[PDB]
Amino acid sequence: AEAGITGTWYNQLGSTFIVTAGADGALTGTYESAVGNAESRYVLTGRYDSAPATDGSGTALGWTVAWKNNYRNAHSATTWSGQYVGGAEARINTQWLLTSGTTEANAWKSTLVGHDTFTKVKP
Amino acid sequence: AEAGITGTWYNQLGSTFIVTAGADGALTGTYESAVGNAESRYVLTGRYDSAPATDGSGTALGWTVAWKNNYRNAHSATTWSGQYVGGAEARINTQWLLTSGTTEANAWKSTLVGHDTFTKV
């Protein structure tokens, strides 16, 4: 259900993720670090399962942020992949991949991997 | 097939991995970077499935290397997880995780991930 996913979410290191879920399966929004302020804000695009299995199953979703806005360009892109579990405490549990542009010789050490949990605070 | 893992293997970048596979699942040997000078060598240890399935499946394996020896200490460790495939053209197909010892503040950026394909050529 797109409604449960729509809102303001936060991760354990203080970053902010604002998102809207469209009825055709689209995800659109912005991602920002705890420094806050205008720019630390970057555009995000993703997809989710608009018709989830019933059960007590989670809803699968994923999104990308490329780290370039009008103030900085870090020359890297991050993708998060996980699932939305609703209830009193709704959470999005994920694993992420961060790739940096490198020359051919340093290509072998271009990607970092890690994991993030988001608690919701507003629609 | 099983014991086919013992030997000398090379990844796509010239690094050499020399391994011995024990009848009950142990993996032991050394790893050395390309250039090949005699301490670029570091110690490795691991485990593999010593009784694999009889349908056409590969043999599951894994191993670790901490990046310290008598000359250098790079305060890191790498693990490779994957499967051996035998035949006229034998290979070991893997993925790996490289973690560095960091402070609490840098803990989120401590691990890299990549993939490697080892052949006897």
Partner: peptide
């Protein structure tokens, strides 16, 4: 070159 793992 600057990590023992590759080349």
């Amino acid at each position: 070159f600057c990590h023992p793992q590759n080349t």
